[PDB]
Scaffold this active site. Structure first.
Site, mmCIF file in Angstrom:
data_model
loop_
_atom_site.group_PDB
_atom_site.id
_atom_site.type_symbol
_atom_site.label_atom_id
_atom_site.label_comp_id
_atom_site.label_asym_id
_atom_site.label_seq_id
_atom_site.Cartn_x
_atom_site.Cartn_y
_atom_site.Cartn_z
ATOM 1 N N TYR B 14 0.884 -1.178 0.043
ATOM 2 C CA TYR B 14 -0.003 -0.199 0.096
ATOM 3 C C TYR B 14 0.873 1.336 -0.033
ATOM 4 O O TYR B 14 0.928 2.259 -0.680
ATOM 5 C CB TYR B 14 -0.858 -0.046 1.128
ATOM 6 N N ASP B 38 -12.287 9.499 3.153
ATOM 7 C CA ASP B 38 -11.199 10.676 3.196
ATOM 8 C C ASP B 38 -11.711 11.985 2.613
ATOM 9 O O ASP B 38 -12.429 11.939 1.647
ATOM 10 C CB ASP B 38 -9.999 10.150 2.871
HETATM 11 C C1 LIG Z 1 -4.634 16.238 0.091
HETATM 12 C C2 LIG Z 1 -4.054 15.920 1.044
HETATM 13 C C3 LIG Z 1 -2.867 14.919 0.545
HETATM 14 C C4 LIG Z 1 -3.384 13.488 0.538
HETATM 15 C C5 LIG Z 1 -3.907 13.014 1.941
HETATM 16 C C6 LIG Z 1 -4.974 13.930 2.458
HETATM 17 C C7 LIG Z 1 -5.375 13.432 3.799
HETATM 18 C C8 LIG Z 1 -6.088 11.888 3.594
HETATM 19 C C9 LIG Z 1 -4.917 11.036 2.917
HETATM 20 C C10 LIG Z 1 -4.957 9.988 3.587
HETATM 21 C C11 LIG Z 1 -3.755 8.846 2.881
HETATM 22 O O1 LIG Z 1 -3.518 7.530 3.365
HETATM 23 C C12 LIG Z 1 -3.458 9.274 1.434
HETATM 24 C C13 LIG Z 1 -3.027 10.524 1.435
HETATM 25 C C14 LIG Z 1 -4.367 11.337 1.668
HETATM 26 C C15 LIG Z 1 -4.133 15.280 2.507
HETATM 27 C C16 LIG Z 1 -5.037 16.155 3.099
HETATM 28 C C17 LIG Z 1 -4.452 17.716 2.744
HETATM 29 C C18 LIG Z 1 -3.360 17.096 1.636
HETATM 30 O O2 LIG Z 1 -2.156 17.472 1.776
HETATM 31 C C19 LIG Z 1 -1.553 18.124 2.699
HETATM 32 O O3 LIG Z 1 -1.253 17.424 3.539
HETATM 33 C C20 LIG Z 1 -1.701 19.758 2.581
HETATM 34 C C21 LIG Z 1 -0.413 20.149 3.663
HETATM 35 C C22 LIG Z 1 -0.813 21.590 3.950
HETATM 36 O O4 LIG Z 1 -0.411 22.461 2.740
HETATM 37 O O5 LIG Z 1 -0.818 22.186 4.837
#
Ligand SMILES: C[C@]12CC[C@H]3[C@@H](CCC4=CC(=O)CC[C@@H]43)[C@@H]1CC[C@H]2OC(=O)CCC(=O)O
Ligand SMILES: C[C@]12CC[C@H]3[C@@H](CCC4=CC(=O)CC[C@@H]43)[C@@H]1CC[C@H]2OC(=O)CCC(=O)O
Lengths: 125, 125
Positions: B14, B38
């Site tokens: 994963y 999510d």
């Molecule tokens: C889209 C996202 C990246 C992808 C992850 C997501 C949160 C949920 C998630 C869980 C996973 O196991 C895969 C990544 C995804 C995040 C929430 C915000 C974001 O990226 C950041 O961390 C943003 C950081 C910032 O700019 O403060």
């Protein structure tokens, strides 16, 4: 968003009752019929008699509850973890499981989950 | 009482797909229509075009994924966490969320959950 301080309070009191083995406080923090998923891959127990009959069965084990990391809380739900330092009849074993949470918007505790396994347990001397 | 070696394998692959930003190994590890959840507020994604379109959009952010603690895997489900080290418009921000896992046996993945919040993030120098 959503002040995670409120969702964390449930986790505190939730464990404060654990540390003090005060189920009365657990059921209190637990809605009139909150749901609890436990054990894993098992069947939860909704209702005050169930949430208590359950959390109570867990209290039957005289152990020590003391968080160690940071509680987690998001949206109306929440997730946190702690360690169980119980004692055996000659040895001392501890555990490191985690718990989930399901509120409804600053309305006490509604549902709850629990995650762990024989890998999150401990076996030292 | 079960061997999390198989379930944990999913967590590895994963992330191995994550570390390699290969949404293929991710969807691959994901059933033909697994289920995602999510970020945190009823935003799941079932099927492949959804799980990938999601896990893929998540890869759009350049970060570093390398577990460090111990992955969790119980029953047909599982739970794990890690840290994310990506850059910002000028400074560097990291992230410390936790993900969940939902399998149906021990060959591939079917459902998965995720947990974290603005508290499990990392802003500063
Ligand atoms: C889209 C996202 C990246 C992808 C992850 C997501 C949160 C949920 C998630 C869980 C996973 O196991 C895969 C990544 C995804 C995040 C929430 C915000 C974001 O990226 C950041 O961390 C943003 C950081 C910032 O700019 O403060
Ligand atoms: C009843 C039990 C103590 C109470 C917990 C239960 C697991 C589910 C659980 C989740 C909670 O959040 C409250 C504690 C209850 C445990 C499973 C085994 C047990 O105690 C042990 O950890 C056993 C340790 C050992 O035998 O070495």
């Amino acid at each position: 968003m959503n002040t995670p301080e409120h969702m964390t309070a449930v986790v505190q009191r939730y464990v404060a009752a654990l540390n003090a083995g005060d189920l009365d406080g657990i059921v209190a923090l637990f809605a009139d019929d909150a749901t609890v998923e436990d054990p894993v891959g098992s069947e939860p127990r909704s209702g005050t008699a169930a949430i208590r009959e359950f959390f109570a069965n867990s209290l039957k084990l005289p152990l020590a509850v003391e968080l160690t990391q940071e509680v987690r809380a998001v949206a109306n739900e929440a997730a946190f973890a702690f360690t169980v330092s119980f004692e055996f009849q000659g040895r001392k074993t501890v555990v490191a499981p985690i718990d989930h949470f399901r509120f409804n918007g600053a309305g006490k505790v509604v549902s709850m989950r629990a995650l762990f396994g024989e890998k999150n347990i401990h076996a030292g001397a």
